[PDB]
Ligand binder design. Sequence first.
Ligand SMILES: Nc1ncnc2c1ncn2[C@@H]1O[C@H](COP(=O)(O)OP(=O)(O)OP(=O)(O)O)[C@@H](O)[C@H]1O
Ligand SMILES: Nc1ncnc2c1ncn2[C@@H]1O[C@H](COP(=O)(O)OP(=O)(O)OP(=O)(O)O)[C@@H](O)[C@H]1O
Ligand SMILES: OC[C@H]1O[C@H](O[C@H]2O[C@H](CO)[C@@H](O)[C@H](O)[C@H]2O)[C@H](O)[C@@H](O)[C@@H]1O
Ligand SMILES: [Mg+2]
Ligand SMILES: [Mg+2]
Lengths: 285, 368, 368, 264, 437
Amino acid sequence: DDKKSERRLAFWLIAPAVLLMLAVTAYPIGYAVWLSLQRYNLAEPHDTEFIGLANYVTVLTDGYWWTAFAVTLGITVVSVAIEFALGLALALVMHRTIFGKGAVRTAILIPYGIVTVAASYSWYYAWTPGTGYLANLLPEGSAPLTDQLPSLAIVVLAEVWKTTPFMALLLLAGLALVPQDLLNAAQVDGAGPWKRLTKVILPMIKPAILVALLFRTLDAFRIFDNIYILTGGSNDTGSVSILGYDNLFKAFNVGLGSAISVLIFLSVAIIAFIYIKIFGAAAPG
Amino acid sequence: AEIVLDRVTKSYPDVRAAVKEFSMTIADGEFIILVGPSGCGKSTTLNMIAGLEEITSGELRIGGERVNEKAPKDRDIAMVFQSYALYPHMTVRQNIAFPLTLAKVPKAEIAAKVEETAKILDLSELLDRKPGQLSGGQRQRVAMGRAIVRSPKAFLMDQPLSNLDAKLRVQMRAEISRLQDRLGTTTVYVTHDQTEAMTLGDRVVVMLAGEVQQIGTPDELYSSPANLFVAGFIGSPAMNFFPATRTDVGVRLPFGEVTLTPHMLDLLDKQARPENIIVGIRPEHIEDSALLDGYARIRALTFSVRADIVESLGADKYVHFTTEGAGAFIARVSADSRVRTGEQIELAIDTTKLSIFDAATGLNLTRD
Amino acid sequence: AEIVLDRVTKSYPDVRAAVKEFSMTIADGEFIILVGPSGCGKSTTLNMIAGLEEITSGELRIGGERVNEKAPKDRDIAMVFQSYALYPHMTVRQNIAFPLTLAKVPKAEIAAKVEETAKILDLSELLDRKPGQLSGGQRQRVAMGRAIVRSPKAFLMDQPLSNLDAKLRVQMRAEISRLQDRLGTTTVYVTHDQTEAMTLGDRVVVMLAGEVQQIGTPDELYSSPANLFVAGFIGSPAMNFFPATRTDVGVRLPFGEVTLTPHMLDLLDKQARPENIIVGIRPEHIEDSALLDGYARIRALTFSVRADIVESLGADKYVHFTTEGAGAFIARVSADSRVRTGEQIELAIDTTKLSIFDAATGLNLTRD
Amino acid sequence: DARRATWWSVVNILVIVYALIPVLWILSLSLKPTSSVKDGKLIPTEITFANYKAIFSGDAFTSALFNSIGIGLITTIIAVVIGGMAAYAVARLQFPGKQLLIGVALLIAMFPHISLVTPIFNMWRGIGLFDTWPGLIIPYITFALPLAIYTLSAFFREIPWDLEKAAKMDGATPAQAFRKVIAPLAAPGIVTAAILVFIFAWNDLLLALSLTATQRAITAPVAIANFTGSSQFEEPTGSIAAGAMVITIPIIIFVLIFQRRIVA
Amino acid sequence: GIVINYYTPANEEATFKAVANRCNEQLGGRFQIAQRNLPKGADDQRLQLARRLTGNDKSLDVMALDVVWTAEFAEAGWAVPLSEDPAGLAEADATENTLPGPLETARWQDELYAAPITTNTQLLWYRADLMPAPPTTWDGMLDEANRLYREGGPSWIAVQGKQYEGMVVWFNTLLQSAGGQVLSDDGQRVTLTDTPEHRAATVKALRIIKSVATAPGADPSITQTDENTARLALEQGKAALEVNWPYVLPSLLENAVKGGVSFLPLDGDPALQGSINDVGTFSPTDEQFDIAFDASKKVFGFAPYPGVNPDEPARVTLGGLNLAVASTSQHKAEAFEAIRCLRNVENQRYTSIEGGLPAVRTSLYDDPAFQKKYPQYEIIRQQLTNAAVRPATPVYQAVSTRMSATLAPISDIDPERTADELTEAVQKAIDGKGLIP
Ligand SMILES: Nc1ncnc2c1ncn2[C@@H]1O[C@H](COP(=O)(O)OP(=O)(O)OP(=O)(O)O)[C@@H](O)[C@H]1O
Ligand SMILES: Nc1ncnc2c1ncn2[C@@H]1O[C@H](COP(=O)(O)OP(=O)(O)OP(=O)(O)O)[C@@H](O)[C@H]1O
Ligand SMILES: OC[C@H]1O[C@H](O[C@H]2O[C@H](CO)[C@@H](O)[C@H](O)[C@H]2O)[C@H](O)[C@@H](O)[C@@H]1O
Ligand SMILES: [Mg+2]
Ligand SMILES: [Mg+2]
């Protein structure tokens, strides 16, 4: 029989992956959830007891969570929209361009291969006045890192330049699928250079752009480096990954810093659920 | 629109010319058939007309203006691809509608045109099924639907009926020839089946190794083949041929002498002499001597051959034989023929249907 | 190996059956041809015999044992696909070699088979180019090499010569027939072209809407079609059919009268009487009244009609006509025929070659 | 066509300029003497190489660079393979592609590392792989693997079906069909996964900073962060920039070779 | 063989590796000192210690704690108090020549939980060419800034304005010099507004911050300045005044010999040319250092930190490092013996002169070589004798974060409201409630 043999092959074939994911990650997830139910503090590990759901209501009722959450959500949707719209454009010029493609393919992927600390300091010194090369282009005394909307705009730029190559590369690799004769068949059926993109290119690459959009969005929600180094926790713009770190690494409140991790996991799970259920062409389909 | 091709070419590195010096004009509403061997450049020619292949040299004109550099959308022509390329992601109704939506027609009028042409292509209703569900003989119809609806400056079609059954071939051929005349639309159609060519064509064009060999009406081609290649290519079974020596009154063949008809003998007197010649005769112009009337028997020549094999088609038989000495064998004998296998039979020929060719050049002598 | 299908089915959820109770043994070395309309279970059957599609109910057997659950590699039957499937990264050379490399044969011996099979197909020189560079007839021809190389337990082929020019088909068919005889190897072949069925077939299978209609030699389907669909199915032009009324010695036609052969009339006495007769004759069995010599005038019967259109192909005239009254019309007539355009014609028929059918059942009553 | 050539020329210089100016700024922060690393000028003057020879004085950075090569390559080699097996399973086979497998694969990438790293520390305290390559490659692969399984599945699911029918008909065993039919057609997916996984490993921090402490396993992304300077509070900016201009070169050389494969 | 693992911050290794080598010779081979690196980030060193300490790591022996961590590591029982030492000697090498500020700084509930090894203090730095004398009070700094602003000179005051702990160090110094404090000495109560003197001190500290942030011609960036930007703001000559730690002097001289500063063009000096080594680091002869330093005293100078009240010395808040023995350690007597060795006067000298970290033992402030390296030594001695301290409490990291998040951005201060807001905010941290901001 085929089916009896194919499940038997399939269980060999997934074996190392499900083992390596489960055996390492099941205990850390289980412990990170279980610590959330209790008054655990890393400074007195013997002086701890079960607290029930109290670690969730005490974060969920707090304006510090909502201010940080609103900022991380607003940064997420605005950055991902720009990075996707730009991502298509960068993938197309990285595909179609006649002029020695290896030059663009390297020069457009090198930003992703810059270290996240050097990238964040590069932008931080770039925007301080009298010391950053593009800060001097502003009117006198501008100092845009000092207040809320301009510093948020600077971190969106510092995010878009560094991660639009992720989506541009998955878009390129997905776009290399599309059979040239179906493009020719659109072109001689009178499709313009944009009219074929919206009606032939995109709907054929739909299951590949889901991957780019999904892993990119689930990463964007947990921003940390580009908003801790550059303008570290100032004028209310702390993303929720900073809110988590500040309640764990530099406060030792393990019983709450784990709850502030479970709630971003849940909120990111709702975004993940919506993306797979609205696309339908997802991996298990 | 008129279409004019002037010395157009396509060529490739191993350079090798896939199409070479091709030159022709096509009148408004004219139905051209293109014919030849596989790999001779036919699709390559349609790709040059469509603009999907860049011309390596020569000139292309439409309606009196040059189009060499103009993109396929701007050329405003409709094509059926050899592969019948069909999208995924779009069920058959909207798969057919696609070019009309790019033309931005009113949505109701698009839908009405789709559900008309669904009947005229025998596709059943507009079906709402994705192409993955459809047979090869169904997919080629869906591909026809895209081309049928638009009303272009010209139709290009690469073997558009090839995957259909024998009834749907003749019935869709009726649907095509109706609509092409109804729209008065200039047409290039490509096929390996010369039996389509001889009924669809206002003219027919035949090509070998990237070069045209003859152009005409189907009756022009069949009555007057310009070379041994085209004389062998057209008709079914193919023309019978024999090497022979010219005679001052005719031609001395391996089986006897045929006196050449005086007017054509005067043309052979006007012509330059080859050192050898080939005759070509239709297998259906070979007959049983007993089935001729006297008024054919006074012109016909007669000879005898051993009936080795036969095969039948009801109205006719393909008597199979063979003879001593080198070539340059079938006779297509009438319904009343009494042949049996292994018999010695008394044959005759319509001596008026001898075409003659230069044996060194392969060029036909009989064509004017 | 024998193949046996037994009440097999395949059905697709809307459920719609594409094959309905199909049942046949196929002998060792037998050359079956499947034929039918578009989209009627052909390729679905080849996918069930290949094991590329699972049967929904009923059974399939090979070599005297059941195979429904067994792997395609357990069956080891060659297949040529409707799509002409090819590997686009590999060259033509390693495409054709691929089953030999899967079989782990020695490199020099594999290359000797590739040479011998390139020559055996008469395909080309050993081109070694990526398949995406090829013309249409070339792709289909290359897709034969995968199947023809490996000398399998059986061949399945789906429209294997469809894209090629006729000058290649007449060769390639002959090579397939030689090889199939030489290897003595069970074959299924599938085609739109019923002229292939009447030259390849050990048996031919005619199918409509997933249901088998007749099984037999080409001559048996041609001279004793079991029902009105298969009676309309093969030869050219299509068989000509009329409503008619029973007569005490034969038939009263809408335009004439025929005394029938007593044995055929006795079959019309063994069968129950329908309310009307349907009658059929092949266009090639219709003749001029001027064609009746002394022998023929005793066995024939006659009437007259206007030619509605006349058309010609050298070897035959297609004389279109229309009678008064309804059909259930073409005559195919000799190259000796002196009929002209639109002429009033006296007509003759062989009273032994007529066929008769039940108007309610559609069954051939002349069949035996 | 001179228009088509002009258009692609201006687009190419626009894209190269757009991408590289913030990298040219990092290079200028590397090359300026510390008297003028705060001067506000994009184009340097009075250039000095002193910042490179500062970070290269002693083996502490160069050993961290060698560690980053070893851990980076072994991560991409293994994670592409065990992600490849799993992806081919969910993409073509009948039953392993259960929505549960993609569900658990997402949960590994969906949950924050900030919580996970302390349970991971007290595991490697026990198992004994702490501050050594295996105890750092292992968590790397586990957190890389969701991207590899989900990406490669979304490419293997798209190789046309009659190529696999032809591989069955030509008698090939499924692993040989994967080797000679599937993987050569899916090569852009393979190469993309290898690049995305390598670049993920090549600049990770939260794990590497917690699971290392000595030259046996310290890696360039942390060895660039913990540089000394003239004070406890003064940022060593020219050393940070000089570190990035060294540590990016493998991330060029890897891409430059592999992008040759990405063509249709 | 016995080895003692001495854990210290990433940037200090070039000092403590050499001092550990010297001790590994001097101990007579009973045991050796092995130097270990923590991360560079201060709040990350805390976690790497806290993990090992919770994980019972037997390879953890002696730690260099930051000054403000003592109450945390003491309340956790991670630091063993010097009063538990097997020898009876660690508490006696502490005290007997140690500066009184740093000595008190280590204690929790008056027990010594650690032994001081390094200390540091802010000072006021000024352009001695632009004013006749340095200002002695924050109103005087505002006066000189306002004067220079009108006159068209440098108008910025360089300070620690950002939301980093330096803002708390500055605020706490103002609050302490105003005569208040953040907490009760037991850390159980928030005392900022419990009596009108404490409110008055608190609103005076807040009002001084508000004033220097908002004054005419202040730095537009002042909401985001730290030690790094404070230094360059004086080196580029945009500020006239700066408050900073003592590392600034050699950094200026190193910039001046490089020609980074326009008011002290020492790159033109033929004797100073070549005073920087192959890796661009200033390494002068005695005469090159004297030439550079003498030329700096023409134009640049240092002064005691300016007061909140007239003719009152400011109680400056300290920085430093404290040694402690880990309660996971397996060689406790030897670990206390290693600590007593690391604090000997010749290793304090090495730490000060070669290492650039100010001594904690009083006798070195009498050494002419120490007085050569640190010209300002008298002002340091004085300030270190009368020091303020950070509010040492187990929840300090929460208190400091929630307090810094209440002040910043410094332009939005309003003294009465912000004294209320801090009283409320710090009380939530002492109660242990809500998220840390
Ligand atoms: N994947 C599918 N989804 C839905 N229906 C299908 C599918 N495959 C086959 N069918 C059904 O089977 C019929 C086509 O049968 P089949 O594929 O055997 O045609 P075929 O033998 O290829 O005909 P031809 O060779 O003349 O094209 C259709 O009418 C369709 O309803
Ligand atoms: N893209 C290409 N690159 C290289 N050579 C090509 C390319 N396309 C076609 N050729 C070659 O040039 C010739 C052109 O033939 P063409 O593709 O027009 O086939 P065709 O004449 O239409 O016959 P068919 O109907 O079988 O396709 C072919 O024989 C082929 O070998
Ligand atoms: O979302 C922007 C950031 O994406 C990357 O970082 C994310 O993915 C890492 C995987 O290891 C995580 O550690 C990190 O927490 C995520 O933020 C990228 O590396 C960053 O440079 C981007 O700022
Ligand atoms: Mg073609
Ligand atoms: Mg088919």
